Coordinates of C-alpha atoms and ligand atoms in Angstrom, one line a residue:
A22 CA -26.0 -45.2 28.5
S23 CA -24.6 -46.7 31.8
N24 CA -24.3 -50.1 31.7
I25 CA -25.5 -53.3 29.7
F26 CA -29.2 -53.1 30.7
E27 CA -29.0 -49.5 29.8
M28 CA -27.4 -50.1 26.2
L29 CA -29.8 -53.1 25.4
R30 CA -32.8 -50.7 25.9
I31 CA -31.8 -48.5 23.3
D32 CA -30.8 -51.0 20.6
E33 CA -34.0 -53.1 21.4
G34 CA -36.5 -50.8 22.6
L35 CA -39.5 -51.4 24.6
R36 CA -43.0 -52.5 23.2
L37 CA -45.5 -54.4 25.2
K38 CA -47.4 -56.2 22.4
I39 CA -45.9 -58.9 20.1
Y40 CA -44.2 -57.2 17.0
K41 CA -42.4 -58.4 14.0
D42 CA -38.8 -57.2 14.3
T43 CA -36.4 -56.2 11.5
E44 CA -36.2 -59.4 10.0
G45 CA -39.8 -60.6 11.0
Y46 CA -39.3 -62.9 13.7
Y47 CA -42.1 -62.6 16.4
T48 CA -40.8 -60.5 19.8
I49 CA -41.8 -58.6 22.7
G50 CA -40.7 -56.5 25.8
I51 CA -37.0 -55.7 25.3
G52 CA -35.9 -57.7 22.3
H53 CA -37.1 -61.0 23.6
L54 CA -37.4 -63.7 21.1
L55 CA -40.2 -66.0 20.7
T56 CA -40.1 -68.1 17.7
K57 CA -38.6 -68.1 14.0
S58 CA -42.1 -69.0 12.3
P59 CA -44.4 -67.2 10.7
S60 CA -47.1 -67.9 13.1
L61 CA -48.7 -65.5 15.3
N62 CA -50.5 -68.0 17.2
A63 CA -46.6 -70.2 17.4
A64 CA -45.6 -67.0 18.9
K65 CA -48.5 -66.9 21.3
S66 CA -47.4 -70.1 22.9
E67 CA -44.0 -69.5 23.6
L68 CA -45.2 -66.2 25.1
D69 CA -47.6 -67.8 27.6
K70 CA -45.4 -70.6 28.8
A71 CA -42.2 -67.6 29.2
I72 CA -44.8 -65.5 31.3
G73 CA -46.7 -68.1 33.1
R74 CA -50.2 -66.9 32.3
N75 CA -52.1 -66.1 28.9
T76 CA -51.1 -63.0 28.2
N77 CA -53.1 -62.8 25.0
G78 CA -50.4 -61.0 23.2
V79 CA -50.0 -58.4 25.7
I80 CA -47.8 -57.7 28.5
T81 CA -47.3 -55.3 31.5
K82 CA -44.3 -53.0 31.8
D83 CA -43.3 -54.6 34.6
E84 CA -43.2 -58.2 33.1
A85 CA -41.2 -56.9 30.5
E86 CA -38.1 -55.9 32.9
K87 CA -38.5 -59.4 34.6
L88 CA -38.1 -61.1 31.4
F89 CA -35.2 -58.8 30.1
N90 CA -33.4 -59.0 33.1
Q91 CA -33.4 -62.7 33.0
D92 CA -32.5 -63.0 29.0
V93 CA -29.5 -61.0 30.2
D94 CA -28.4 -63.6 33.0
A95 CA -28.7 -66.2 30.4
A96 CA -26.9 -64.1 27.7
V97 CA -24.2 -64.2 30.2
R98 CA -24.1 -67.9 31.2
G99 CA -24.0 -69.1 27.4
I100 CA -20.6 -66.9 27.2
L101 CA -19.0 -69.0 30.2
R102 CA -20.6 -71.9 29.1
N103 CA -18.9 -71.4 25.5
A104 CA -15.1 -72.4 25.1
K105 CA -15.1 -69.4 22.6
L106 CA -16.8 -67.0 24.4
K107 CA -15.5 -67.2 27.7
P108 CA -11.8 -66.5 27.4
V109 CA -12.3 -63.3 25.1
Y110 CA -15.0 -62.3 27.9
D111 CA -12.3 -62.6 30.1
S112 CA -10.1 -60.2 28.8
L113 CA -12.4 -57.6 27.9
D114 CA -13.2 -54.7 30.1
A115 CA -16.8 -53.8 31.4
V116 CA -17.8 -51.6 28.9
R117 CA -16.9 -53.9 26.3
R118 CA -18.3 -56.9 27.8
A119 CA -21.4 -55.2 27.2
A120 CA -20.9 -55.2 23.5
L121 CA -20.0 -58.8 23.4
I122 CA -22.9 -59.3 25.6
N123 CA -25.0 -57.0 22.9
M124 CA -24.2 -59.4 20.3
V125 CA -25.2 -62.2 22.1
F126 CA -28.2 -60.7 23.3
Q127 CA -29.2 -60.4 19.1
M128 CA -27.6 -63.2 17.5
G129 CA -27.6 -66.1 20.4
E130 CA -24.4 -67.6 21.5
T131 CA -23.7 -69.8 19.1
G132 CA -24.1 -66.9 16.5
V133 CA -21.0 -64.5 17.9
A134 CA -19.4 -67.6 18.6
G135 CA -18.6 -67.9 14.7
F136 CA -16.8 -64.8 14.8
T137 CA -13.9 -66.8 15.6
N138 CA -11.4 -64.2 14.0
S139 CA -13.0 -61.3 15.2
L140 CA -12.7 -62.6 18.8
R141 CA -9.2 -63.3 18.6
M142 CA -8.6 -59.6 17.8
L143 CA -10.8 -58.5 20.6
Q144 CA -8.7 -60.8 23.1
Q145 CA -5.8 -59.4 21.4
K146 CA -6.6 -55.8 22.0
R147 CA -6.4 -54.9 18.4
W148 CA -9.7 -53.0 18.1
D149 CA -9.3 -51.2 15.1
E150 CA -9.0 -54.6 12.4
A151 CA -11.5 -56.5 14.9
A152 CA -13.7 -53.6 14.0
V153 CA -13.2 -53.8 10.5
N154 CA -13.7 -57.5 10.3
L155 CA -16.9 -56.9 12.1
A156 CA -17.9 -54.4 9.4
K157 CA -17.9 -56.6 6.7
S158 CA -20.8 -59.5 7.7
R159 CA -24.2 -60.1 7.4
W160 CA -24.7 -58.7 10.9
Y161 CA -23.6 -55.5 9.4
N162 CA -25.3 -55.8 6.4
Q163 CA -28.9 -56.5 8.3
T164 CA -28.6 -54.2 11.0
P165 CA -26.0 -51.4 9.9
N166 CA -26.9 -48.9 12.5
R167 CA -26.8 -51.1 15.5
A168 CA -23.8 -53.3 14.4
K169 CA -22.0 -49.8 14.3
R170 CA -23.0 -48.8 17.9
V171 CA -22.0 -52.0 19.1
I172 CA -18.4 -51.9 17.0
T173 CA -17.8 -48.6 18.1
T174 CA -18.0 -49.8 21.7
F175 CA -15.2 -52.4 20.9
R176 CA -13.2 -50.0 19.4
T177 CA -13.6 -47.1 21.7
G178 CA -14.2 -48.7 24.7
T179 CA -16.7 -46.0 25.7
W180 CA -20.2 -45.5 26.0
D181 CA -20.4 -42.5 23.2
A182 CA -21.7 -44.6 21.0
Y183 CA -25.0 -44.8 22.7
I184 CA -24.9 -41.1 24.5
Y185 CA -24.0 -39.1 21.2
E186 CA -25.9 -40.2 18.1
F187 CA -24.2 -39.0 14.7
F188 CA -24.9 -35.1 14.2
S189 CA -21.9 -34.1 11.9
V190 CA -18.7 -34.3 9.9
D191 CA -15.5 -32.7 11.2
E192 CA -15.3 -29.0 11.2
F193 CA -12.9 -28.4 8.1
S194 CA -15.3 -30.2 6.3
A195 CA -18.7 -28.9 7.2
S196 CA -17.5 -25.5 6.2
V197 CA -16.2 -26.6 2.7
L198 CA -19.5 -28.3 2.3
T199 CA -21.2 -25.1 3.1
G200 CA -18.9 -22.3 1.8
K201 CA -19.2 -20.7 -1.8
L202 CA -16.3 -23.3 -2.9
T203 CA -18.7 -26.0 -3.1
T204 CA -21.9 -24.0 -3.9
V205 CA -21.1 -21.6 -6.0
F206 CA -17.1 -22.3 -7.9
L207 CA -18.3 -26.0 -8.7
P208 CA -21.3 -25.4 -10.3
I209 CA -20.2 -22.6 -12.3
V210 CA -17.2 -24.7 -13.4
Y211 CA -19.5 -27.6 -14.3
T212 CA -22.0 -25.8 -16.1
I213 CA -19.2 -24.5 -18.5
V214 CA -18.0 -28.1 -19.1
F215 CA -21.4 -28.9 -19.7
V216 CA -21.9 -26.2 -22.5
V217 CA -18.7 -26.5 -23.8
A218 CA -17.8 -30.3 -23.4
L219 CA -21.2 -31.8 -24.4
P220 CA -21.8 -30.5 -28.0
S221 CA -18.2 -30.3 -28.9
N222 CA -17.9 -34.5 -28.1
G223 CA -21.3 -34.8 -29.5
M224 CA -20.0 -33.4 -32.7
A225 CA -16.9 -35.2 -32.5
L226 CA -18.8 -38.6 -31.5
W227 CA -21.1 -37.9 -34.6
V228 CA -17.9 -37.1 -37.0
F229 CA -15.9 -40.6 -35.9
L230 CA -19.1 -42.4 -36.5
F231 CA -21.0 -41.2 -39.5
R232 CA -18.3 -39.0 -41.1
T233 CA -14.9 -40.6 -40.8
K234 CA -14.8 -43.1 -43.8
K235 CA -11.3 -43.8 -42.9
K236 CA -12.1 -45.8 -39.6
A237 CA -8.4 -46.1 -38.7
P238 CA -7.4 -47.5 -34.9
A239 CA -7.0 -43.8 -33.9
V240 CA -10.7 -42.7 -34.7
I241 CA -11.9 -45.4 -32.8
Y242 CA -9.9 -44.5 -29.8
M243 CA -11.0 -40.9 -30.0
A244 CA -14.7 -42.3 -30.4
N245 CA -14.6 -43.8 -26.9
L246 CA -12.7 -40.9 -25.7
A247 CA -15.6 -38.8 -26.7
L248 CA -18.1 -41.5 -25.4
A249 CA -16.5 -41.5 -22.1
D250 CA -16.9 -37.7 -22.0
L251 CA -20.4 -38.0 -22.9
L252 CA -21.3 -40.6 -20.5
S253 CA -20.5 -38.3 -17.7
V254 CA -21.2 -34.7 -19.0
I255 CA -24.6 -35.7 -19.6
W256 CA -25.1 -36.3 -15.9
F257 CA -24.0 -32.8 -15.2
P258 CA -27.5 -31.0 -15.1
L259 CA -27.9 -33.3 -11.8
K260 CA -24.4 -32.6 -10.6
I261 CA -24.8 -29.0 -11.0
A262 CA -28.2 -28.8 -9.3
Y263 CA -26.6 -31.1 -6.7
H264 CA -24.4 -28.4 -5.4
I265 CA -26.2 -25.4 -6.2
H266 CA -28.5 -26.5 -3.6
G267 CA -25.7 -26.7 -0.7
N268 CA -24.4 -30.5 -1.8
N269 CA -27.4 -31.9 -1.3
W270 CA -28.7 -35.3 -3.1
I271 CA -32.3 -36.1 -3.1
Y272 CA -32.4 -38.5 -6.5
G273 CA -31.5 -41.5 -4.8
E274 CA -28.6 -43.8 -3.8
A275 CA -28.6 -45.8 -7.2
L276 CA -28.4 -42.5 -9.3
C277 CA -25.7 -41.3 -6.9
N278 CA -23.6 -44.0 -7.8
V279 CA -24.1 -43.9 -11.7
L280 CA -23.0 -40.4 -11.2
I281 CA -19.6 -41.8 -9.1
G282 CA -19.2 -44.6 -11.7
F283 CA -19.1 -42.5 -14.6
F284 CA -17.0 -39.9 -13.3
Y285 CA -14.2 -42.3 -12.4
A286 CA -15.1 -44.1 -15.6
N287 CA -14.1 -41.2 -17.7
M288 CA -11.3 -40.2 -15.4
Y289 CA -9.3 -43.8 -16.3
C290 CA -11.2 -44.6 -19.7
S291 CA -9.6 -40.8 -20.7
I292 CA -6.0 -41.8 -19.6
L293 CA -6.4 -45.5 -21.2
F294 CA -7.7 -44.0 -24.3
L295 CA -4.8 -41.6 -24.5
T296 CA -2.5 -44.0 -23.9
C297 CA -3.8 -46.1 -27.1
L298 CA -4.0 -43.1 -29.3
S299 CA -0.7 -41.9 -28.6
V300 CA 1.1 -45.1 -28.8
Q301 CA -1.0 -45.8 -31.9
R302 CA 0.3 -42.9 -33.8
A303 CA 3.6 -43.2 -32.5
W304 CA 4.1 -46.7 -33.9
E305 CA 2.5 -45.7 -37.1
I306 CA 5.7 -43.9 -37.8
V307 CA 8.3 -45.6 -36.2
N308 CA 6.8 -49.3 -37.2
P309 CA 3.9 -48.8 -39.7
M310 CA 1.9 -52.0 -41.2
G311 CA -0.6 -52.4 -43.7
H312 CA -4.2 -53.9 -42.3
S313 CA -6.0 -50.8 -41.7
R314 CA -9.2 -52.9 -41.7
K315 CA -7.8 -55.8 -39.3
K316 CA -5.8 -53.1 -37.0
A317 CA -9.4 -51.5 -37.0
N318 CA -11.1 -54.4 -35.6
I319 CA -8.1 -55.2 -33.0
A320 CA -8.7 -51.2 -31.9
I321 CA -12.4 -52.1 -31.3
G322 CA -11.7 -55.5 -29.2
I323 CA -9.2 -53.5 -27.2
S324 CA -12.0 -50.7 -26.3
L325 CA -14.0 -53.4 -25.3
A326 CA -11.6 -54.7 -23.1
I327 CA -10.7 -51.5 -21.4
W328 CA -14.6 -50.8 -21.0
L329 CA -15.1 -54.2 -19.0
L330 CA -12.0 -54.0 -17.3
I331 CA -12.8 -50.5 -15.9
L332 CA -16.5 -51.7 -15.5
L333 CA -14.9 -54.3 -13.1
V334 CA -12.5 -52.1 -11.3
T335 CA -14.8 -49.2 -10.6
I336 CA -17.1 -52.0 -8.7
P337 CA -15.9 -51.0 -5.5
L338 CA -17.4 -47.6 -5.8
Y339 CA -20.9 -48.8 -7.3
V340 CA -21.7 -51.5 -4.7
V341 CA -20.8 -49.1 -1.6
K342 CA -23.0 -46.9 0.1
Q343 CA -22.3 -43.4 -1.2
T344 CA -24.9 -41.4 0.3
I345 CA -25.1 -40.1 4.0
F346 CA -27.6 -37.6 5.6
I347 CA -25.5 -35.2 8.1
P348 CA -28.0 -34.0 10.4
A349 CA -25.9 -30.6 11.5
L350 CA -25.9 -29.5 7.8
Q351 CA -29.3 -30.9 7.1
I352 CA -28.0 -32.2 3.5
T353 CA -27.6 -35.5 2.1
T354 CA -24.0 -36.0 0.6
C355 CA -22.9 -37.6 -2.5
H356 CA -19.3 -38.8 -2.7
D357 CA -18.3 -35.9 -1.1
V358 CA -18.6 -37.8 2.4
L359 CA -17.6 -41.3 3.2
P360 CA -20.7 -42.8 4.8
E361 CA -18.5 -45.5 6.8
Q362 CA -15.3 -44.4 8.1
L363 CA -14.0 -48.0 8.6
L364 CA -13.9 -48.8 4.9
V365 CA -11.1 -45.9 4.3
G366 CA -8.1 -48.6 4.8
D367 CA -10.0 -50.3 1.7
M368 CA -10.5 -47.0 0.0
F369 CA -6.6 -45.9 0.6
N370 CA -4.9 -49.2 -1.2
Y371 CA -7.6 -49.1 -3.6
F372 CA -6.7 -45.4 -5.2
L373 CA -3.1 -46.1 -4.6
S374 CA -3.4 -49.1 -7.0
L375 CA -5.3 -47.1 -9.7
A376 CA -2.7 -44.0 -9.3
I377 CA 0.1 -46.6 -10.0
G378 CA -1.1 -49.2 -12.6
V379 CA -3.9 -47.0 -14.1
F380 CA -2.0 -43.3 -14.0
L381 CA 1.8 -43.4 -13.5
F382 CA 2.4 -46.5 -15.9
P383 CA -0.1 -45.1 -18.8
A384 CA 1.5 -41.7 -17.9
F385 CA 4.8 -43.3 -18.7
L386 CA 3.8 -45.1 -22.1
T387 CA 2.0 -41.7 -23.0
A388 CA 4.9 -39.3 -22.9
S389 CA 7.6 -41.9 -24.4
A390 CA 5.4 -42.2 -27.2
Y391 CA 5.8 -38.4 -27.7
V392 CA 9.4 -38.8 -27.4
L393 CA 9.8 -41.3 -30.5
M394 CA 6.9 -39.5 -32.5
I395 CA 8.3 -36.2 -32.1
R396 CA 11.8 -37.1 -32.9
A397 CA 10.6 -39.3 -36.0
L398 CA 8.7 -36.4 -37.2
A399 CA 11.9 -34.2 -36.6
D400 CA 14.0 -36.5 -38.0
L401 CA 12.1 -36.7 -41.9
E402 CA 11.9 -32.9 -41.4
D403 CA 15.5 -32.5 -41.7
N404 CA 15.7 -34.6 -44.5
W405 CA 13.6 -32.8 -46.4
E406 CA 15.1 -29.2 -45.4
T407 CA 18.7 -30.8 -45.9
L408 CA 17.4 -32.1 -49.5
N409 CA 16.2 -28.6 -50.2
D410 CA 19.0 -26.3 -48.6
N411 CA 21.6 -28.2 -50.3
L412 CA 20.1 -28.0 -53.9
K413 CA 19.4 -24.3 -53.6
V414 CA 23.2 -24.0 -52.9
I415 CA 24.4 -26.1 -56.1
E416 CA 22.5 -23.2 -58.0
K417 CA 24.5 -20.6 -56.2
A418 CA 28.0 -22.2 -55.9
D419 CA 30.7 -21.6 -58.3
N420 CA 33.7 -23.3 -57.0
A421 CA 33.9 -27.2 -57.6
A422 CA 34.5 -27.4 -54.1
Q423 CA 30.6 -26.5 -52.7
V424 CA 29.5 -28.4 -55.5
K425 CA 30.4 -31.5 -55.2
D426 CA 29.9 -31.0 -51.2
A427 CA 26.4 -30.2 -51.7
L428 CA 25.5 -33.5 -53.9
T429 CA 27.2 -35.7 -51.2
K430 CA 24.8 -34.1 -48.3
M431 CA 21.8 -34.2 -50.4
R432 CA 22.6 -38.0 -51.3
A433 CA 22.6 -38.9 -47.8
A434 CA 19.7 -36.6 -46.7
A435 CA 17.6 -38.7 -49.8
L436 CA 19.0 -41.8 -48.5
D437 CA 17.4 -41.6 -45.1
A438 CA 14.2 -39.9 -46.3
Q439 CA 13.9 -43.1 -48.2
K440 CA 13.9 -45.1 -45.4
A441 CA 11.2 -43.0 -43.6
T442 CA 7.9 -43.1 -43.6
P443 CA 5.8 -40.2 -45.7
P444 CA 3.0 -38.1 -44.2
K445 CA 0.5 -39.6 -46.7
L446 CA 1.2 -43.3 -46.6
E447 CA 0.6 -44.1 -42.7
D448 CA -1.4 -46.7 -43.0
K449 CA 0.4 -48.3 -45.8
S450 CA 3.0 -51.3 -45.2
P451 CA 6.4 -50.8 -46.2
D452 CA 5.8 -53.6 -48.4
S453 CA 3.1 -52.0 -50.4
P454 CA 3.2 -51.1 -54.0
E455 CA 2.5 -47.1 -52.9
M456 CA 5.9 -47.6 -50.4
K457 CA 8.0 -49.1 -53.5
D458 CA 6.8 -46.2 -55.6
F459 CA 7.8 -43.6 -53.0
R460 CA 11.4 -45.2 -52.4
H461 CA 11.7 -45.8 -56.3
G462 CA 11.3 -42.1 -56.6
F463 CA 14.5 -41.6 -54.4
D464 CA 15.9 -44.0 -56.8
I465 CA 15.7 -42.0 -59.6
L466 CA 16.8 -38.9 -57.8
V467 CA 19.9 -40.4 -56.3
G468 CA 21.1 -42.2 -59.5
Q469 CA 20.8 -38.6 -60.7
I470 CA 22.8 -37.5 -57.9
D471 CA 25.5 -39.9 -58.8
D472 CA 25.5 -38.6 -62.6
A473 CA 25.9 -35.4 -61.0
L474 CA 28.5 -36.5 -58.9
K475 CA 30.3 -38.2 -61.8
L476 CA 30.7 -34.7 -63.5
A477 CA 31.9 -33.2 -59.9
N478 CA 34.6 -35.9 -59.6
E479 CA 35.7 -35.5 -63.1
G480 CA 36.4 -31.7 -62.8
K481 CA 33.1 -30.9 -65.0
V482 CA 32.1 -27.8 -62.6
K483 CA 29.7 -25.7 -64.5
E484 CA 28.1 -29.1 -66.1
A485 CA 27.3 -30.4 -62.5
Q486 CA 25.3 -27.1 -61.9
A487 CA 23.3 -27.8 -64.9
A488 CA 22.2 -31.4 -63.2
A489 CA 21.0 -29.2 -60.3
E490 CA 18.0 -28.2 -62.6
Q491 CA 17.3 -31.5 -63.6
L492 CA 17.1 -32.4 -59.6
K493 CA 14.6 -30.0 -59.4
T494 CA 12.2 -31.7 -61.7
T495 CA 13.0 -35.0 -59.7
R496 CA 11.8 -33.5 -57.0
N497 CA 8.6 -31.7 -57.6
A498 CA 7.7 -34.5 -59.8
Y499 CA 8.1 -37.8 -57.4
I500 CA 9.3 -36.8 -53.9
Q501 CA 7.6 -33.1 -53.3
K502 CA 4.4 -34.5 -53.0
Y503 CA 4.9 -36.6 -50.4
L504 CA 7.0 -34.4 -48.3
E505 CA 5.3 -31.5 -49.2
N506 CA 3.6 -30.7 -45.6
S507 CA 5.8 -33.0 -43.2
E508 CA 7.0 -29.8 -41.5
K509 CA 3.1 -29.0 -40.7
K510 CA 2.8 -32.7 -39.7
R511 CA 5.5 -32.0 -37.1
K512 CA 3.9 -28.6 -35.7
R513 CA 0.5 -30.8 -34.8
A514 CA 2.4 -33.6 -33.1
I515 CA 3.9 -30.7 -30.7
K516 CA 0.8 -29.4 -30.2
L517 CA -0.6 -32.1 -29.3
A518 CA 2.2 -33.1 -26.9
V519 CA 1.3 -29.8 -25.4
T520 CA -2.5 -30.5 -25.2
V521 CA -2.0 -33.8 -23.5
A522 CA 0.5 -32.6 -20.9
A523 CA -1.7 -29.9 -19.6
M524 CA -4.5 -32.4 -19.5
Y525 CA -2.4 -34.6 -17.3
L526 CA -1.1 -31.2 -15.5
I527 CA -4.5 -30.2 -14.7
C528 CA -6.7 -33.2 -14.6
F529 CA -5.2 -36.1 -14.1
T530 CA -1.9 -35.3 -11.3
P531 CA -3.7 -33.1 -9.0
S532 CA -6.6 -35.9 -8.9
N533 CA -4.7 -39.2 -8.8
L534 CA -2.0 -37.7 -5.9
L535 CA -4.7 -35.9 -3.8
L536 CA -7.0 -39.0 -4.2
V537 CA -4.4 -40.9 -2.7
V538 CA -3.4 -38.1 0.0
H539 CA -6.9 -37.5 1.0
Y540 CA -7.6 -41.1 2.0
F541 CA -4.1 -41.4 3.7
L542 CA -5.1 -38.7 6.1
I543 CA -8.6 -40.2 7.1
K544 CA -6.7 -43.5 7.5
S545 CA -4.2 -41.9 9.7
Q546 CA -6.1 -39.1 11.5
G547 CA -9.5 -39.5 10.7
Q548 CA -9.7 -36.2 8.6
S549 CA -7.6 -34.6 6.1
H550 CA -6.9 -31.2 5.6
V551 CA -6.4 -31.7 2.1
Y552 CA -10.2 -32.0 1.8
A553 CA -10.4 -28.5 -0.1
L554 CA -7.9 -29.2 -2.5
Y555 CA -9.5 -32.7 -3.2
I556 CA -12.5 -31.1 -4.0
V557 CA -10.7 -28.3 -6.5
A558 CA -8.6 -31.3 -8.1
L559 CA -11.9 -33.4 -8.5
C560 CA -13.3 -30.5 -10.2
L561 CA -10.8 -29.4 -12.3
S562 CA -10.3 -33.2 -13.7
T563 CA -13.7 -32.6 -15.6
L564 CA -11.8 -30.6 -17.7
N565 CA -10.4 -32.9 -19.7
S566 CA -13.7 -33.5 -21.7
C567 CA -13.1 -29.4 -22.9
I568 CA -9.3 -30.0 -23.7
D569 CA -10.3 -33.4 -25.5
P570 CA -11.6 -31.9 -28.6
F571 CA -8.2 -30.1 -29.2
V572 CA -6.6 -33.8 -29.1
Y573 CA -9.5 -34.7 -31.8
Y574 CA -8.3 -31.5 -34.0
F575 CA -4.4 -32.3 -34.0
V576 CA -5.4 -35.9 -34.6
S577 CA -8.5 -36.2 -37.0
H578 CA -8.4 -34.6 -40.3
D579 CA -12.0 -35.0 -40.6
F580 CA -13.1 -33.6 -37.2
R581 CA -11.0 -30.2 -38.2
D582 CA -13.3 -29.9 -41.5
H583 CA -16.4 -30.1 -39.2
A584 CA -14.7 -27.7 -36.7
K585 CA -13.7 -25.2 -39.2
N586 CA -17.1 -25.2 -41.3
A587 CA -19.1 -24.7 -37.9
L588 CA -17.2 -21.6 -36.6
Ligands
LIG601 C1 -23.2 -35.6 -7.3 C2 -21.9 -36.0 -7.5 C3 -20.8 -35.8 -6.7 C4 -19.5 -36.0 -7.3 C5 -19.1 -37.4 -7.7 C6 -18.2 -37.9 -8.0 F1 -17.9 -39.2 -8.6 C7 -17.0 -36.8 -8.5 C8 -17.2 -35.5 -8.0 C9 -18.7 -35.1 -7.2 C10 -18.5 -33.9 -7.0 O1 -19.2 -33.0 -7.8 C11 -17.2 -33.1 -6.3 N1 -16.9 -32.4 -7.2 C12 -15.5 -31.6 -6.5 C13 -15.5 -32.7 -5.5 N2 -16.8 -33.5 -5.2
LIG602 NA1 -12.1 -37.7 -21.4

């Protein structure tokens, strides 16, 4: 391309017969509009008086140029006539002047005058902002390839958009998209995840629905967690095939956006449902309640709320073009390459919003939940331990000092465990009969400790020791039943905290951090060297559905049975 006339020939083409354009309007020659009515004869009448003769639908190669050269002169006249088009045009360099005339040639004088905001940007020499504004319009929607070339002309001020057609991405990306990292490493890891995560979550989902007859809020969160897992792993056979064949998608744009949707869905559902589960289980320890049926219904509603909120927040991933054909690579990439480099500004803010509000914020609530959970389970452990240890001391103490001392320490140890929630009565309210019998079991014990203290304070040494065997009976009858396996419960919480931390360290943190970094560099330089790390990050993020079964194992008691029996 050299000038306006040469530019338009490339956009409008050259046809000597009346044809329907992309929208359906009958045109002829080089982008010469005849009429906007669905009538072949109505276009004939407008052509005959435009030429001067009866062309009968077919014009000459010479008459095309003569009519084209007049359309350009009129397109310019309208620009200077227009109060909104003239000042911008007077500010634009000859290259950008052609781009403006190209728009007027296509949408007419009035149409282009509607772009008031973009024209102001072009006048203020703000090429990038103007380019973005123009990228979101019906103009871009109806004729994207056409609009891109013109927009690029505005942005760059060169004829490059008409000299060089798109051929390839940056070199660093093209090497990755042809390298073994994507074509060998990824499909292997993804295959593993498919074999491991699908049946494990498949069975977990089955247990939570058809084998768990508790239906506690924890089960419900884990059921959606398993559901989020499944709804992504099922698409992996198409995901694996994609990479094996050199990152080439041949299943359609809609089906690509499906995979993309459910990918980021599981990405964020997992975090949110982890935050729910962790907080819920921590909350049943610090401040337990007793509406296991109502608390369940609530947890279901919360899950629906989360599912719909993510369906709404992943809209700018569903609705945007996510496939692009790269001529030099002869492949059609899904997700891995952004088809429209003008939307990077929107993409950056978007993944920065999520990285804060749907990553850090739930991570903060998730970590501190285990902080309160572990400590509370550690205190109850210390109580049960202080009880047994001091009770074992009395039977092995000779002096009156060690006897009175152990009784006093054992007394306070039982008074703290009394206020604490037993491992069994989790969904039981603190005012329930079950809890009242639990506390009463300590009241009987504590009273007996006072009866041994009564002897220990009255100098009756050996007689207070005999009371210890009476305390043993009270322990096994009323207390040990409840605190038998509280130290085993503490160990499960810790392993759960380790499990979750690893999931954050491997699947969540590398992904969300780099997602911001990736689009930040494309926004700043047009390319990112972290592209390889971005890919590895996204790959390792799918491991969460392989780590998720370990979560169900440390929380669900029913899942353990089906886990152990199977293997
Ligand atoms: C066809 C689906 C392509 C896709 C879509 C996503 F939403 C996330 C990752 C990938 C892709 O598998 C990948 N892994 C690592 C980097 N890119
Ligand atoms: Na998950």
